[PDB]
Ligand binder design. Structure first.
Ligand SMILES: Cc1cn([C@H]2C[C@H](O)[C@@H](COP(=O)(O)OP(=O)(O)O)O2)c(=O)[nH]c1=O
Ligand SMILES: Cc1cn([C@H]2C[C@H](O)[C@@H](COP(=O)(O)OP(=O)(O)O)O2)c(=O)[nH]c1=O
Lengths: 376, 378
């Protein structure tokens, strides 16, 4: 590897557009790639007064399948080579070599992935020089401490460097926890906003149903997403099955991402349900009594919160300032994170099978948007 | 296929031994000259410092079995299989192929860990040791070479690696450098005792540090594609920019040392030429002739090349990492706060133009004094 793909040059060119225009930089809008980060961004982006700003979504990594584009029927799919002043448009800019995208004097950028912010910051430099204007504010939607997605390496420092950008930048953090993490690490931004976690609307509709608890250990398993420590969980499970004589009594189920069923010993298996429908998921939550869900990151994830609010005792990990055991009584946070300690806690909870919340906000968002709009 | 287990933590099965005396056990992944990088060689150096007359010594290979050639560097050691239980004063035991096998552990076997996963094993052995022999847990000696969780993205390996620092049992930490030690302290890690050894100039190199240097226009790059911590690709990117945004670039030769790689085009017909790992002598020579150096270590711990370059009169471009800021160690070192290709390329231009002193790291040019003190705690 000679180059660094994430930072392939983002070539801009002059545009005649005189009005303001919000530009959302996202890697993809494909339903396949449609994970929580981009969907949250899109949700947030939707909040901007469409009458005060033109909106352009710029795809940086993946071109849409015609099916994917049906979720954006009000948007005009325009090639990077065109310069139309549509009020709503999408431009594919992943195949980007020797091509350019039009950037107006008052084009304002909203970054998501660290590398979209890397590009944005370089665009604001070019913008400022070509138009002879003060650098425009960048809107940075920070979903995680993304350098953590990489081992110490080129990508790590480049990802981080986007936080060290000295230009005008407004940070919008996913959760207050994340915001605080950044503050402790000493990062500075022109302005800091954050949006708190909020229960999925469909799920809330079930949160009051009568629950007939069974002996089910529900695992949030995603082999693909290292942050979720799938293998660590599997290891702890293997120990649990061995060091607990009443293990045979329990069903262990994996949800989140489809995977092969995994033998834990004694004929017991971790059975994968994959990504259940919100309804099925809600049902399973009501019947389940113990939950394991890990997120190696300062930012809170949803599953530990959902499980807890459905009456599960949830085993989860602490990460620096993140300690969910203070959010809800049902959550237990392990300080020493190894298979042995998980397996042990798992035994204690099973034996416990034979309340209090400090995160009221979770069950009733982008109020700041309006305020942010007045700074651009 | 999906990775189900975590290989680094394959069980480390022990069994009773009759050995009554004390015995220091060095857990290292490999002693092969191929795998013989600075971490294990430093450990071995440190391990050598222990009064061989007060302790029996056993090196336990955890990841790789030795080639007969590799074993010639340990001619005084008896290569013994894990199945034997001999009370030799010096021995090596291959314990990488470890499934359904066990290694003998004496009541007074004391362990010295290196890689995070060797410490992971050690800590689990001390538990078994304590239960089987009905004794208080023995101190573990942890030679911490880096914040090894950093070798991994957020993941299972990351937390397991870190968990070895959260071990609540008796553990003595011996850090590579004071910088690293401080990093751990800031992150809040606790150990029974904390020691550290500072960086010290390679002895062979010191022999050249006084030679007269005829500086040429050479930009010396510490390039190791294999070692991500060294940000090879980041350096190559900055180089490409430099060649483009500097009109006097054609005047400079850009050379890569450290690890052999394909020669890399930077534009304008200019190439980053790899010399690989030069002999200490050749390296020393090149250092004398070279005037600008780029060497990056994404880690709180100091690396050697930036220090070596600086002490040979090179202006060195290097990265800052949290508490590590080498620009305070030596006047020749420049530490970038904002680490991207543009900023490196720019600094690289400024230095070239500068081509047309002060040291606060005296210790670097005149080690394991603590060993004796540590010996008295085991
Ligand atoms: C586990 C699970 C979650 N969900 C929903 C509710 C959760 O809040 C949300 C979490 O998964 P997701 O948002 O896909 O994670 P990420 O954003 O990191 O890709 O998805 C389901 O619809 N079905 C399921 O089976
Ligand atoms: C670049 C280079 C370094 N060295 C020496 C000087 C340094 O003190 C030392 C550091 O490189 P090395 O030991 O390969 O790095 P690590 O310790 O991370 O494996 O190697 C050489 O002997 N020859 C060379 O060509």
């Amino acid at each position: 590897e000679t180059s660094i793909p994430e930072i392939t040059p983002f070539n801009a060119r002059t545009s005649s557009i005189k009005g303001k225009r919000l530009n959302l930089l996202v890697p993809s809008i494909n339903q396949e790639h449609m994970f929580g980060g981009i969907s949250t961004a899109l949700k947030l982006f939707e909040q901007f007064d469409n009458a005060a700003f033109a909106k352009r979504i710029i795809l940086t990594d993946a071109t849409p399948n015609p099916k994917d584009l049906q979720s954006f029927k009000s948007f005009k799919y325009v090639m990077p080579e065109e310069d139309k002043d549509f009020a709503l448009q999408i431009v594919p800019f992943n195949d980007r070599y020797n091509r350019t995208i039009p950037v107006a004097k008052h084009d304002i950028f909203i970054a998501t992935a660290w590398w979209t912010a890397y590009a944005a910051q370089r665009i604001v430099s070019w913008q400022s020089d070509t138009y002879g204007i003060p650098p425009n504010k960048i809107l940075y939607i920070i979903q995680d401490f993304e350098p953590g997605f990489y081992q110490w390496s080129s990508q790590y420092v480049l990802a981080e460097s986007t936080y060290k950008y000295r230009g005008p930048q407004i940070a919008v953090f996913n959760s207050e926890l994340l915001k605080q993490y950044f503050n402790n690490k000493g990062y500075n931004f022109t302005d800091e906003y954050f949006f708190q976690p909020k229960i999925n609307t469909t799920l809330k509709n079930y949160i009051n149903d009568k629950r007939q608890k069974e002996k089910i250990i529900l695992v949030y398993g995603r082999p693909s997403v290292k942050r979720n420590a799938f293998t660590l969980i599997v290891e702890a499970l293997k120990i649990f099955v061995q060091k607990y004589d009443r293990s045979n009594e329990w069903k262990i189920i994996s949800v989140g991402e489809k995977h092969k069923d995994i033998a834990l010993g004694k004929g017991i298996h971790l059975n994968s349900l994959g990504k259940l429908t919100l309804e099925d998921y809600a049902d399973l939550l009501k019947r389940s009594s113990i939950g394991i869900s890990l997120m190696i990151s300062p930012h809170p994830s949803y599953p530990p919160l959902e499980m807890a609010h459905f009456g599960l005792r949830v085993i989860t990990n602490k990460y620096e300032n993140k300690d969910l055991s203070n959010w809800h009584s049902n959550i237990v946070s392990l300080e020493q994170l190894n298979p042995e300690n998980i397996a042990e806690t798992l035994v204690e909870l099973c034996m416990s099978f034979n309340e209090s919340s400090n995160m009221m906000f979770y069950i009733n968002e982008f109020s700041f948007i309006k305020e942010i709009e007045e700074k651009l």
